[PDB]
Amino acid sequence: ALSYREAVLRAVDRLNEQSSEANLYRLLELDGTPKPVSFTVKETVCPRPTRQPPELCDFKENGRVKQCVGTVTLDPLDITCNEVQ
């Protein structure tokens, strides 16, 4: 469970690392073999090149919200996030 939650936060970090957007996204809601994941992330006030954990970054109001899905290994990134329509 805990390792699970941590792998999701870790994924959020990777999405931010691979991102091309201006700001860091932060976890909004969390809904051996890789485990399925489904969670939403939301845009924060912190600009992408910032060595600040996203959880210390306030959400941007009216900031973009995305739904991410895929998998995580409790020990490559396999999640794709699409803006919520």
Swiss-Prot record:
GO BP terms in the entry: antimicrobial humoral immune response mediated by antimicrobial peptide; defense response to Gram-negative bacterium; defense response to Gram-positive bacterium; innate immune response
Localization: Secreted
Keywords recorded for this protein, A-Z: Amidation, Antibiotic, Antimicrobial, Disulfide bond, Secreted, Signal
Any one GO cellular component localisation term in the record: extracellular space
Propeptide residue intervals: 1-85
UniProt superkingdom: Eukaryota
Annotated disulfide bonds: 46-57, 68-81
GO molecular function annotations of the record: lipopolysaccharide binding
Function per UniProt: Microbicidal activity. Active against E.coli, Listeria monocytogenes and C.albicans, in vitro.
Family: Belongs to the cathelicidin family.
Protein name: Protegrin-3
Protein source organism: Sus scrofa (Pig)
Lineage of source species: Eukaryota, Metazoa, Chordata, Craniata, Vertebrata
Span within the parent record: 31 to 128 of 149
